[PDB]
């Protein structure tokens, strides 16, 4: 109470306290060296130990924001590396942290970590605390809004992988599959949390509560409304704190919520038992990623209370938010086969009916057939997910990505090529993950992951706005975000980008790139072909990229690579224009 840092240190323990502060500094200061950050963590850990022993000691009565924010401004390489970030230090709290958070880089362009099993299993023994410590540093700086306590968990997933594989003869065959899967889990985790932080920023905590009521109601249909409301309230406060960089307060409140859920597990979900017999980080993660519980047999029809009841306006008038919260809980728990956006869309439609009906002469007659408005809202995304999986299953991942790059480049040609390539590549991998699932699990998978990919586009677009359409879709409404983007079409009055030959000129440098980086260069060229020829068919673009593809493979196989590229390049560049007419 007297000393907050004393409280956090005592509650969290040294390793996790240090760990979260290393992650904290790594997110705020993303280009600072590892060894520099290690000292800053030690200097804070040092001071926290003094306060826990004697809370009356100087500076111990200050808030963690102040104490952390003060330590950030004493960084010697602050003005040199980060520039404008040093201007924030002149401002006072709470405006100083708000200033720091804006200067977090969502796209830091950092070296793509190669999994080198010979180098790392050896480095795991050379300096182990440096190893697991550096892993936290590297993930944190590439993902400045990554869920702090969730990153500590991934570091222990990292630890366990090396201790299991390094002993074995073939270190590569064991480690690579395990590490490859972890990179996929980290990108998804980063994406999930960024949408929580984005929702706070753009739509406030009411939007974050609504989303969570829907998701946890699906996860815990056995749980009553007062439990879901309690868990949502506590969990919203947790994500608010983490998203504002208060990782220590975030981590402590998260541990309290883990304890609560597990002390009341029988009346929340039968699927939590395994989770609650685990250490804090394993327990917390297991709760967050818990599979949905079996549906209760004893639930009545919704219409009885939400269409038929004659005192619905009375319920609505006195307690607007609570009664809508009640509707979302009841609709969500029955429909785990629905996306969270679809549930929030339905709930927004219900509110809209009551605002208009309780004003009219005969309200009961008005909101009698409110459930008829939902059937078309359900069918639209069902139709979209079918067409995309039908396309994916036919043409496979790479060609599905290319089809989506063309789709989104036409929707927004003003958006930077790297941004368009990223969402096309992301949404293609969603095809791989989601389409191989049963129909009931497929819609939520696709549309939930789509929301994460659209948020990424909105985050990158917010930093550097180019389109008013994209701004409107990104800022209007979170529930209506997917519909808004789905509706986007090629601007009739779009001025084609003028032809630059250098943009479509390849060299021998491409041959030495890893396959992923090789595809990005070709997929970057595809986006540019669309920007130059926006009225070209997807089938014309598929063919021209196939020629570029064949041209690269040929010259990268040639005895004289640079000689091949010099001769063949301009010929293909010239014919490609005529082909896209
Ligand atoms: C869970 C409840 C119910 C929520 C509402 C459910 C219906 C709805 C759907 C939307 O697409 C946008 C806003 C609303 C209309 C809503 F999401 C927000 O207003 C926030 C809300 C009241 C809530 O989140 C609270 O804040 C409760 O106090
Ligand atoms: C509106 C987005 C719907 C689908 C998102 C599913 C993936 C999980 C991300 C969690 C982010 C929650 C968003 C929020 O805080 O409102």
Coordinates of C-alpha atoms and ligand atoms in Angstrom, one line a residue:
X1 CA 0.0 0.0 0.0
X2 CA 2.7 2.5 1.2
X3 CA 5.3 1.2 -1.5
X4 CA 3.8 -0.2 -4.8
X5 CA 7.2 -1.6 -6.0
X6 CA 7.6 -3.4 -2.6
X7 CA 4.1 -4.9 -3.1
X8 CA 4.8 -6.0 -6.7
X9 CA 8.3 -7.5 -5.8
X10 CA 6.8 -9.3 -2.7
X11 CA 3.7 -10.6 -4.8
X12 CA 5.5 -11.5 -8.1
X13 CA 9.0 -12.8 -6.9
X14 CA 12.5 -11.9 -8.3
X15 CA 12.6 -13.9 -11.6
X16 CA 9.1 -12.8 -12.9
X17 CA 9.6 -9.2 -11.5
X18 CA 13.0 -9.0 -13.4
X19 CA 11.5 -10.9 -16.4
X20 CA 8.5 -8.4 -16.8
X21 CA 10.8 -5.3 -16.4
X22 CA 13.3 -6.7 -19.1
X23 CA 10.2 -7.3 -21.4
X24 CA 8.9 -3.8 -20.3
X25 CA 12.2 -1.9 -21.3
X26 CA 12.6 -4.1 -24.5
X27 CA 9.1 -2.9 -25.7
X28 CA 9.6 0.9 -24.8
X29 CA 13.2 0.9 -26.2
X30 CA 13.3 -1.6 -29.1
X31 CA 16.8 -0.9 -30.6
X32 CA 18.7 -0.7 -27.3
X33 CA 21.3 -3.5 -26.8
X34 CA 20.5 -6.6 -24.6
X35 CA 23.5 -6.0 -22.1
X36 CA 22.4 -2.3 -21.6
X37 CA 18.7 -3.4 -20.7
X38 CA 20.1 -6.1 -18.3
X39 CA 21.7 -3.3 -16.2
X40 CA 18.5 -1.1 -16.2
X41 CA 16.5 -4.3 -15.0
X42 CA 19.2 -4.9 -12.3
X43 CA 19.1 -1.2 -11.2
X44 CA 15.2 -1.4 -10.8
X45 CA 15.4 -4.9 -9.1
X46 CA 18.1 -3.5 -6.8
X47 CA 15.9 -0.5 -5.7
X48 CA 12.7 -2.8 -5.3
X49 CA 14.7 -5.0 -2.8
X50 CA 15.5 -1.9 -0.6
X51 CA 11.8 -0.9 -0.5
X52 CA 10.4 -4.4 0.4
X53 CA 12.8 -4.4 3.4
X54 CA 12.1 -0.7 4.5
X55 CA 9.0 0.9 2.8
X56 CA 9.8 4.3 4.6
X57 CA 13.1 4.6 2.4
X58 CA 13.3 7.4 -0.1
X59 CA 11.6 7.1 -3.6
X60 CA 9.8 3.9 -2.5
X61 CA 6.4 5.8 -2.0
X62 CA 6.5 6.8 -5.8
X63 CA 4.2 5.0 -8.4
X64 CA 5.8 2.4 -10.8
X65 CA 4.9 4.6 -13.8
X66 CA 7.1 7.4 -12.3
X67 CA 9.9 5.0 -11.1
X68 CA 10.0 3.1 -14.5
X69 CA 9.5 6.3 -16.6
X70 CA 12.3 8.1 -14.6
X71 CA 14.8 5.1 -15.2
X72 CA 13.9 5.2 -19.0
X73 CA 14.9 8.9 -19.2
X74 CA 18.4 8.2 -17.6
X75 CA 19.3 6.0 -20.7
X76 CA 22.5 7.5 -22.2
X77 CA 21.6 6.6 -25.8
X78 CA 18.0 8.0 -25.6
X79 CA 18.2 11.2 -27.8
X80 CA 20.8 9.5 -30.2
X81 CA 18.8 6.4 -31.1
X82 CA 15.1 7.3 -30.5
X83 CA 15.2 11.1 -31.0
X84 CA 11.6 12.4 -30.5
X85 CA 11.1 9.8 -27.6
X86 CA 13.5 12.1 -25.5
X87 CA 11.0 15.0 -25.8
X88 CA 8.4 12.9 -23.8
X89 CA 10.8 13.0 -20.8
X90 CA 10.1 16.8 -20.4
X91 CA 6.3 16.0 -20.0
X92 CA 4.9 14.8 -16.6
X93 CA 2.7 11.7 -15.8
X94 CA 0.2 10.6 -16.9
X95 CA 1.0 12.3 -20.3
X96 CA 4.7 11.1 -20.2
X97 CA 3.7 7.3 -20.6
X98 CA 1.0 8.1 -23.2
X99 CA 3.8 9.9 -25.1
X100 CA 6.2 6.9 -24.8
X101 CA 3.4 4.4 -25.9
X102 CA 2.9 6.4 -29.2
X103 CA 6.7 6.0 -29.9
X104 CA 6.4 2.1 -29.7
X105 CA 7.2 0.7 -33.3
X106 CA 4.6 -1.8 -34.5
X107 CA 7.0 -2.5 -37.6
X108 CA 10.6 -2.2 -36.4
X109 CA 12.3 -4.0 -39.4
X110 CA 14.6 -6.2 -37.2
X111 CA 16.8 -9.2 -38.3
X112 CA 14.6 -12.3 -38.9
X113 CA 15.9 -14.8 -36.3
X114 CA 17.2 -18.0 -38.0
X115 CA 16.8 -21.2 -35.9
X116 CA 20.5 -22.3 -35.9
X117 CA 20.4 -25.6 -33.8
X118 CA 24.3 -26.0 -33.8
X119 CA 24.8 -22.3 -32.7
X120 CA 22.0 -22.2 -30.1
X121 CA 22.3 -25.5 -28.2
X122 CA 26.0 -24.5 -27.7
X123 CA 24.9 -20.9 -26.7
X124 CA 22.4 -22.5 -24.3
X125 CA 25.4 -23.8 -22.3
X126 CA 27.9 -20.9 -22.9
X127 CA 25.5 -18.5 -21.1
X128 CA 22.0 -19.9 -20.2
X129 CA 20.4 -16.9 -18.2
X130 CA 21.8 -14.8 -21.2
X131 CA 20.0 -17.2 -23.6
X132 CA 16.5 -17.3 -22.0
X133 CA 17.0 -13.6 -21.1
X134 CA 17.9 -12.6 -24.8
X135 CA 14.8 -14.6 -26.1
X136 CA 12.5 -12.4 -24.0
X137 CA 14.4 -9.3 -25.3
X138 CA 14.2 -10.3 -29.0
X139 CA 10.4 -11.2 -29.0
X140 CA 9.5 -8.1 -26.8
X141 CA 11.2 -5.5 -29.2
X142 CA 9.6 -7.1 -32.3
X143 CA 6.1 -7.0 -30.5
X144 CA 5.9 -3.9 -28.4
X145 CA 2.3 -4.6 -27.1
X146 CA 2.9 -8.4 -26.5
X147 CA 1.0 -9.6 -23.3
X148 CA 3.9 -9.4 -20.7
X149 CA 3.2 -12.4 -18.4
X150 CA 2.3 -14.5 -21.6
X151 CA 5.9 -13.8 -23.0
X152 CA 7.5 -15.3 -19.8
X153 CA 5.4 -18.5 -20.5
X154 CA 6.8 -18.7 -24.1
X155 CA 10.4 -18.3 -22.7
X156 CA 9.8 -21.5 -20.6
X157 CA 8.3 -23.2 -23.7
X158 CA 11.7 -22.2 -25.3
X159 CA 13.7 -23.5 -22.3
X160 CA 11.9 -26.9 -22.3
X161 CA 12.4 -27.4 -26.1
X162 CA 16.3 -27.1 -25.9
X163 CA 16.7 -29.3 -22.7
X164 CA 14.7 -32.1 -24.6
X165 CA 16.4 -31.8 -28.1
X166 CA 20.1 -30.7 -27.4
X167 CA 20.9 -34.1 -25.7
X168 CA 19.7 -36.1 -28.8
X169 CA 22.1 -36.9 -31.6
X170 CA 20.2 -35.0 -34.5
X171 CA 19.6 -31.6 -32.8
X172 CA 18.0 -30.2 -35.9
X173 CA 15.2 -32.8 -36.5
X174 CA 14.0 -32.5 -32.8
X175 CA 14.3 -28.7 -32.4
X176 CA 13.2 -27.1 -35.7
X177 CA 9.6 -28.6 -35.7
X178 CA 9.2 -27.4 -32.0
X179 CA 10.7 -23.9 -32.6
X180 CA 8.8 -23.4 -36.0
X181 CA 5.5 -24.1 -34.1
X182 CA 6.5 -21.6 -31.3
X183 CA 7.1 -18.7 -33.9
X184 CA 3.5 -19.4 -35.2
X185 CA 2.1 -19.3 -31.5
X186 CA 4.0 -16.0 -30.8
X187 CA 2.8 -14.2 -34.0
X188 CA -0.9 -15.2 -33.1
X189 CA -0.4 -14.2 -29.4
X190 CA 1.1 -10.8 -30.4
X191 CA -1.9 -10.3 -32.9
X192 CA -4.6 -11.2 -30.3
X193 CA -3.2 -8.7 -27.6
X194 CA -2.6 -5.9 -30.2
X195 CA -6.4 -6.0 -31.0
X196 CA -7.2 -5.7 -27.2
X197 CA -4.9 -2.6 -26.9
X198 CA -6.3 -1.2 -30.2
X199 CA -9.9 -1.6 -28.9
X200 CA -9.0 0.4 -25.7
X201 CA -7.2 3.1 -27.8
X202 CA -10.0 3.4 -30.5
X203 CA -13.3 2.3 -28.9
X204 CA -12.6 2.4 -25.1
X205 CA -12.9 -0.4 -22.4
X206 CA -16.8 -0.8 -23.0
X207 CA -15.9 -2.4 -26.4
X208 CA -13.2 -4.6 -24.7
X209 CA -15.8 -5.8 -22.0
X210 CA -18.4 -6.5 -24.8
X211 CA -15.9 -8.6 -26.7
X212 CA -14.8 -10.6 -23.6
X213 CA -18.4 -11.2 -22.4
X214 CA -19.0 -12.9 -25.8
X215 CA -15.7 -14.9 -25.9
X216 CA -15.8 -16.1 -22.2
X217 CA -19.6 -16.9 -22.4
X218 CA -18.6 -19.2 -25.4
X219 CA -15.7 -20.7 -23.4
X220 CA -17.7 -21.1 -20.1
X221 CA -21.4 -21.7 -21.0
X222 CA -21.9 -23.5 -17.6
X223 CA -20.8 -20.3 -15.8
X224 CA -23.7 -17.9 -14.7
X225 CA -23.8 -14.2 -15.7
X226 CA -22.4 -12.9 -12.4
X227 CA -19.3 -15.2 -12.7
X228 CA -18.8 -14.1 -16.4
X229 CA -19.3 -10.5 -15.4
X230 CA -16.8 -10.9 -12.5
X231 CA -14.1 -12.6 -14.7
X232 CA -14.7 -10.1 -17.6
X233 CA -14.4 -7.0 -15.2
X234 CA -11.1 -8.4 -13.6
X235 CA -9.7 -9.6 -17.0
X236 CA -10.5 -6.2 -18.7
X237 CA -8.6 -4.3 -15.9
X238 CA -5.6 -6.8 -16.5
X239 CA -5.4 -6.0 -20.3
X240 CA -5.9 -2.2 -19.8
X241 CA -2.8 -2.2 -17.4
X242 CA -0.6 -4.4 -19.8
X243 CA -1.6 -2.3 -22.9
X244 CA -0.6 0.9 -20.9
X245 CA 2.8 -0.8 -20.1
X246 CA 2.0 -1.5 -16.4
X247 CA 3.2 -5.1 -16.8
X248 CA 3.9 -5.6 -13.0
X249 CA 0.3 -4.4 -11.9
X250 CA -1.0 -6.4 -15.0
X251 CA 0.9 -9.6 -13.9
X252 CA -0.2 -9.3 -10.2
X253 CA -4.0 -8.8 -11.1
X254 CA -3.6 -11.7 -13.6
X255 CA -2.3 -14.0 -10.8
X256 CA -5.3 -13.0 -8.6
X257 CA -7.7 -13.8 -11.5
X258 CA -6.0 -17.2 -12.0
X259 CA -6.5 -18.0 -8.3
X260 CA -10.2 -16.9 -8.4
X261 CA -11.0 -19.0 -11.6
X262 CA -9.3 -22.1 -10.0
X263 CA -11.0 -21.7 -6.5
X264 CA -14.4 -21.5 -8.4
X265 CA -13.5 -23.9 -11.3
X266 CA -16.3 -26.4 -10.7
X267 CA -19.0 -23.7 -11.3
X268 CA -17.2 -22.1 -14.3
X269 CA -16.0 -25.1 -16.5
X270 CA -15.1 -28.8 -16.0
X271 CA -12.3 -28.2 -18.6
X272 CA -10.2 -26.0 -16.1
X273 CA -9.1 -28.9 -13.8
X274 CA -5.8 -29.8 -15.7
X275 CA -4.9 -26.0 -15.9
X276 CA -5.3 -25.5 -12.0
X277 CA -2.7 -28.2 -11.1
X278 CA 0.1 -26.2 -12.9
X279 CA 2.5 -23.4 -12.0
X280 CA 1.3 -19.7 -12.3
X281 CA 2.4 -19.1 -16.0
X282 CA 1.3 -22.6 -17.2
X283 CA -2.0 -22.2 -15.2
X284 CA -2.6 -18.6 -16.6
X285 CA -1.8 -19.7 -20.2
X286 CA -4.0 -22.9 -19.9
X287 CA -7.0 -20.8 -18.7
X288 CA -6.5 -18.2 -21.5
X289 CA -6.4 -21.0 -24.2
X290 CA -8.9 -23.4 -22.5
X291 CA -11.2 -25.3 -24.9
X292 CA -14.9 -24.5 -24.8
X293 CA -17.0 -26.4 -22.2
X294 CA -20.0 -28.8 -23.2
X295 CA -23.3 -26.9 -23.6
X296 CA -25.9 -27.3 -20.7
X297 CA -29.0 -29.3 -21.5
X298 CA -31.4 -27.1 -19.4
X299 CA -31.3 -23.7 -21.2
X300 CA -34.6 -22.2 -22.5
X301 CA -35.3 -20.3 -25.8
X302 CA -34.1 -16.7 -25.9
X303 CA -37.4 -15.2 -27.4
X304 CA -39.3 -15.9 -24.1
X305 CA -37.2 -13.1 -22.4
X306 CA -35.8 -11.0 -25.3
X307 CA -38.7 -11.0 -27.8
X308 CA -41.9 -12.0 -25.9
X309 CA -41.6 -10.5 -22.4
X310 CA -43.9 -7.4 -22.2
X311 CA -41.5 -5.6 -19.6
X312 CA -38.5 -5.6 -22.0
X313 CA -38.6 -1.7 -22.3
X314 CA -38.8 -1.5 -18.5
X315 CA -35.7 -3.8 -18.2
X316 CA -34.0 -1.7 -20.9
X317 CA -34.9 1.8 -19.6
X318 CA -33.6 1.3 -16.0
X319 CA -30.5 -0.9 -16.8
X320 CA -29.5 -0.4 -20.5
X321 CA -25.9 -1.8 -20.4
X322 CA -26.7 -4.7 -17.9
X323 CA -29.8 -6.0 -19.9
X324 CA -27.7 -5.8 -23.2
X325 CA -24.8 -7.6 -21.4
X326 CA -27.4 -10.2 -20.4
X327 CA -28.6 -10.7 -24.0
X328 CA -24.9 -11.1 -25.3
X329 CA -24.1 -13.6 -22.5
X330 CA -27.2 -15.8 -23.3
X331 CA -26.8 -15.6 -27.2
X332 CA -23.0 -16.2 -27.0
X333 CA -23.0 -19.3 -24.6
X334 CA -25.4 -21.1 -27.0
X335 CA -23.4 -20.2 -30.2
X336 CA -19.7 -21.2 -29.9
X337 CA -20.0 -21.9 -33.7
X338 CA -20.3 -18.0 -34.2
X339 CA -17.4 -15.5 -34.5
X340 CA -17.1 -12.8 -31.7
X341 CA -17.8 -10.0 -34.3
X342 CA -21.0 -11.8 -35.4
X343 CA -22.2 -12.0 -31.8
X344 CA -21.4 -8.3 -31.2
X345 CA -23.1 -7.5 -34.6
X346 CA -26.3 -9.3 -33.4
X347 CA -26.1 -7.5 -30.0
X348 CA -25.7 -4.1 -31.8
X349 CA -28.8 -4.9 -33.9
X350 CA -30.8 -5.8 -30.7
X351 CA -30.0 -2.4 -29.0
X352 CA -30.9 -0.6 -32.3
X353 CA -34.4 -2.4 -32.3
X354 CA -35.2 -1.4 -28.6
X355 CA -34.1 2.3 -29.2
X356 CA -36.7 2.5 -32.1
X357 CA -39.4 0.1 -30.6
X358 CA -39.7 1.5 -27.0
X359 CA -40.3 5.0 -28.7
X360 CA -43.1 3.6 -31.0
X361 CA -46.9 3.4 -30.0
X362 CA -46.9 -0.5 -29.4
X363 CA -43.4 -1.7 -28.4
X364 CA -44.2 -5.4 -27.7
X365 CA -45.6 -5.8 -31.3
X366 CA -42.4 -4.0 -32.6
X367 CA -39.6 -6.1 -31.0
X368 CA -41.8 -9.3 -31.5
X369 CA -39.8 -10.3 -34.7
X370 CA -36.4 -8.9 -33.7
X371 CA -34.8 -12.5 -34.1
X372 CA -35.7 -12.3 -37.9
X373 CA -33.0 -9.6 -38.3
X374 CA -30.2 -12.0 -37.1
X375 CA -30.7 -14.8 -39.8
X376 CA -29.1 -12.7 -42.6
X377 CA -26.3 -11.5 -40.3
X378 CA -25.4 -15.3 -39.7
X379 CA -25.5 -16.3 -43.4
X380 CA -23.2 -13.6 -44.9
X381 CA -19.9 -14.7 -43.1
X382 CA -20.9 -18.4 -43.5
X383 CA -21.0 -17.7 -47.4
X384 CA -17.6 -15.8 -47.3
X385 CA -15.7 -18.6 -45.3
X386 CA -17.1 -21.3 -47.7
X387 CA -15.8 -19.4 -50.9
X388 CA -12.3 -18.7 -49.4
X389 CA -11.8 -22.3 -48.2
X390 CA -13.2 -23.6 -51.6
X391 CA -10.5 -21.4 -53.2
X392 CA -7.7 -22.4 -50.8
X393 CA -8.3 -26.2 -51.0
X394 CA -8.1 -25.9 -54.9
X395 CA -5.1 -23.6 -55.5
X396 CA -3.2 -24.2 -52.1
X397 CA -1.5 -21.6 -49.7
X398 CA 0.9 -19.6 -52.0
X399 CA -1.7 -19.0 -54.8
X400 CA -4.4 -18.2 -52.2
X401 CA -2.1 -15.6 -50.6
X402 CA -1.5 -14.1 -54.2
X403 CA -5.3 -14.1 -54.8
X404 CA -5.8 -12.1 -51.5
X405 CA -2.8 -9.7 -52.3
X406 CA -4.6 -8.9 -55.6
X407 CA -8.0 -8.6 -53.8
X408 CA -6.8 -6.2 -51.0
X409 CA -4.5 -4.2 -53.4
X410 CA -7.6 -3.4 -55.6
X411 CA -9.6 -2.5 -52.4
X412 CA -6.8 -0.1 -51.3
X413 CA -4.1 0.7 -53.9
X414 CA -2.7 3.7 -51.9
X415 CA -1.6 1.3 -49.0
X416 CA 2.2 0.5 -49.0
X417 CA 3.3 -2.8 -50.8
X418 CA 4.8 -4.4 -47.6
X419 CA 1.4 -3.9 -45.7
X420 CA -0.6 -5.4 -48.6
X421 CA 1.9 -8.4 -48.9
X422 CA 1.7 -9.0 -45.1
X423 CA -2.2 -9.2 -44.9
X424 CA -2.3 -11.4 -48.1
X425 CA 0.4 -13.7 -46.6
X426 CA -1.3 -13.7 -43.1
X427 CA -4.8 -14.5 -44.4
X428 CA -3.4 -17.3 -46.7
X429 CA -2.0 -19.1 -43.6
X430 CA -5.4 -18.6 -41.9
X431 CA -6.7 -20.8 -44.9
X432 CA -4.1 -23.5 -43.8
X433 CA -5.1 -23.3 -40.1
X434 CA -8.9 -22.9 -40.2
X435 CA -10.2 -24.6 -43.4
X436 CA -9.0 -28.1 -42.2
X437 CA -11.4 -27.8 -39.2
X438 CA -15.1 -28.9 -38.9
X439 CA -17.8 -26.4 -40.1
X440 CA -18.8 -25.5 -36.5
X441 CA -15.1 -24.6 -35.6
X442 CA -14.3 -23.1 -39.1
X443 CA -16.4 -19.9 -39.2
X444 CA -15.1 -18.7 -35.8
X445 CA -11.4 -19.6 -36.6
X446 CA -11.5 -17.8 -40.0
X447 CA -13.4 -14.6 -38.9
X448 CA -11.6 -14.3 -35.5
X449 CA -8.1 -14.6 -37.3
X450 CA -9.4 -12.2 -40.0
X451 CA -10.2 -9.5 -37.3
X452 CA -6.5 -9.8 -36.1
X453 CA -5.2 -9.4 -39.7
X454 CA -7.6 -6.4 -40.3
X455 CA -6.4 -4.8 -37.0
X456 CA -2.7 -5.1 -38.1
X457 CA -3.6 -3.3 -41.4
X458 CA -5.4 -0.6 -39.3
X459 CA -2.5 -0.2 -36.9
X460 CA 0.1 0.3 -39.7
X461 CA -2.4 2.5 -41.7
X462 CA -3.0 4.7 -38.5
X463 CA 0.8 5.6 -38.3
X464 CA 0.8 6.6 -42.1
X465 CA -2.8 7.2 -43.4
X466 CA -3.1 7.0 -47.2
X467 CA -6.9 6.1 -47.7
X468 CA -10.1 7.7 -46.2
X469 CA -12.0 4.5 -46.9
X470 CA -9.5 2.5 -44.7
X471 CA -9.6 5.2 -42.0
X472 CA -13.5 5.0 -41.9
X473 CA -13.6 1.2 -41.7
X474 CA -10.8 1.2 -39.0
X475 CA -12.3 3.9 -36.8
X476 CA -16.2 3.6 -37.4
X477 CA -17.2 0.4 -35.5
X478 CA -15.2 -2.8 -34.4
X479 CA -18.3 -5.1 -34.9
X480 CA -18.9 -3.7 -38.5
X481 CA -15.1 -3.8 -39.3
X482 CA -15.1 -7.1 -41.4
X483 CA -18.4 -6.1 -43.2
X484 CA -16.8 -2.6 -44.0
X485 CA -13.6 -4.1 -45.5
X486 CA -15.6 -6.9 -47.4
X487 CA -17.7 -4.0 -49.1
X488 CA -14.5 -2.1 -50.3
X489 CA -14.1 -2.3 -54.1
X490 CA -11.7 -0.7 -56.6
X491 CA -12.2 3.1 -56.7
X492 CA -13.7 3.9 -60.2
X493 CA -11.7 7.2 -60.1
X494 CA -8.3 5.5 -59.1
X495 CA -5.3 6.9 -61.1
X496 CA -3.1 3.9 -62.1
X497 CA 0.5 4.1 -60.7
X498 CA 2.9 5.1 -63.6
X499 CA 5.2 2.2 -64.8
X500 CA 8.7 2.1 -63.1
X501 CA 10.9 -0.6 -64.8
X502 CA 13.2 -0.7 -61.7
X503 CA 10.2 -2.0 -59.6
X504 CA 10.0 -5.1 -61.9
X505 CA 13.8 -5.5 -62.4
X506 CA 15.3 -8.7 -60.6
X507 CA 19.0 -9.4 -60.0
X508 CA 21.1 -12.5 -58.8
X509 CA 20.8 -11.2 -55.1
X510 CA 17.3 -12.9 -55.0
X511 CA 18.9 -16.4 -55.5
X512 CA 20.7 -16.3 -52.1
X513 CA 17.5 -15.3 -50.2
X514 CA 15.6 -17.9 -48.1
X515 CA 12.4 -19.2 -49.8
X516 CA 10.0 -17.0 -47.6
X517 CA 12.0 -13.8 -48.5
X518 CA 12.1 -15.0 -52.2
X519 CA 8.2 -15.3 -52.3
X520 CA 7.8 -11.8 -50.6
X521 CA 9.9 -10.2 -53.4
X522 CA 7.7 -11.9 -56.1
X523 CA 4.5 -11.2 -54.0
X524 CA 5.7 -7.5 -53.7
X525 CA 6.0 -7.4 -57.5
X526 CA 2.4 -8.9 -57.9
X527 CA 1.0 -6.0 -55.7
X528 CA 3.0 -3.5 -57.8
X529 CA 1.5 -5.1 -61.1
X530 CA -2.0 -4.5 -59.6
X531 CA -1.1 -0.9 -58.6
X532 CA 0.0 -0.3 -62.3
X533 CA -2.8 -2.3 -63.9
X534 CA -5.8 -2.2 -61.5
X535 CA -8.4 -3.4 -64.1
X536 CA -6.3 -6.5 -65.0
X537 CA -8.1 -9.8 -64.1
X538 CA -6.7 -12.1 -61.2
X539 CA -6.1 -14.7 -64.0
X540 CA -4.0 -12.3 -66.1
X541 CA -1.9 -11.4 -62.9
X542 CA -1.6 -15.2 -61.9
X543 CA -0.1 -15.9 -65.5
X544 CA 2.3 -12.8 -65.5
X545 CA 3.7 -13.8 -62.0
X546 CA 4.1 -17.4 -63.2
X547 CA 6.4 -16.0 -66.0
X548 CA 8.3 -13.9 -63.4
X549 CA 8.5 -17.0 -61.2
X550 CA 9.8 -19.2 -64.1
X551 CA 12.3 -16.4 -65.1
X552 CA 13.8 -16.2 -61.5
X553 CA 14.1 -20.1 -61.1
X554 CA 15.8 -20.3 -64.6
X555 CA 18.4 -17.5 -63.9
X556 CA 19.1 -18.7 -60.3
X557 CA 19.9 -22.1 -61.9
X558 CA 22.1 -20.6 -64.6
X559 CA 26.0 -21.1 -64.6
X560 CA 26.3 -17.2 -65.0
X561 CA 23.3 -15.9 -62.8
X562 CA 23.8 -12.1 -63.3
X563 CA 24.4 -12.7 -67.1
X564 CA 21.0 -14.5 -67.3
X565 CA 19.1 -11.7 -65.3
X566 CA 20.7 -8.9 -67.5
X567 CA 19.5 -10.5 -70.8
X568 CA 16.0 -11.9 -69.9
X569 CA 14.7 -9.3 -67.4
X570 CA 13.8 -6.4 -69.7
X571 CA 12.1 -8.8 -72.3
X572 CA 9.7 -10.2 -69.6
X573 CA 9.2 -6.6 -68.1
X574 CA 8.1 -5.4 -71.7
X575 CA 5.7 -8.3 -72.5
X576 CA 4.2 -8.3 -69.0
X577 CA 2.7 -4.8 -69.7
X578 CA 1.0 -6.1 -73.0
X579 CA -0.3 -9.2 -71.1
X580 CA -2.1 -7.1 -68.4
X581 CA -4.0 -4.9 -71.0
Ligands
LIG1 C1 -21.1 -6.3 -22.0 C2 -21.8 -5.0 -22.1 C3 -22.9 -4.9 -23.2 C4 -22.2 -4.1 -24.2 C5 -23.0 -3.7 -25.5 C6 -23.5 -4.9 -26.2 C7 -24.1 -4.6 -27.6 C8 -23.2 -3.7 -28.4 C9 -22.7 -4.2 -29.5 C10 -21.7 -3.4 -30.3 O1 -21.3 -3.8 -31.4 C11 -21.4 -2.1 -29.8 C12 -21.9 -1.6 -28.6 C13 -22.8 -2.4 -27.8 C14 -24.1 -1.6 -27.6 C15 -22.1 -2.8 -26.4 F1 -21.0 -3.6 -26.8 C16 -21.4 -1.6 -25.7 O2 -22.2 -0.5 -25.5 C17 -20.7 -2.1 -24.3 C18 -21.7 -2.9 -23.4 C19 -22.8 -2.0 -22.9 C20 -21.0 -3.7 -22.3 O3 -19.7 -4.1 -22.7 C21 -20.7 -2.9 -21.0 O4 -19.9 -1.9 -21.0 C22 -21.5 -3.2 -19.8 O5 -21.3 -2.3 -18.7
LIG2 C1 -13.6 -7.8 -33.0 C2 -12.6 -8.9 -33.1 C3 -13.2 -10.3 -33.1 C4 -12.3 -11.5 -33.2 C5 -11.0 -11.4 -32.5 C6 -10.5 -12.8 -32.1 C7 -9.1 -13.0 -31.7 C8 -8.8 -12.6 -30.3 C9 -8.3 -11.2 -30.1 C10 -8.7 -10.6 -28.8 C11 -8.9 -9.1 -28.9 C12 -10.2 -8.6 -28.2 C13 -10.6 -7.3 -28.8 C14 -11.2 -6.4 -27.8 O1 -10.6 -6.1 -26.7 O2 -12.4 -5.9 -28.0

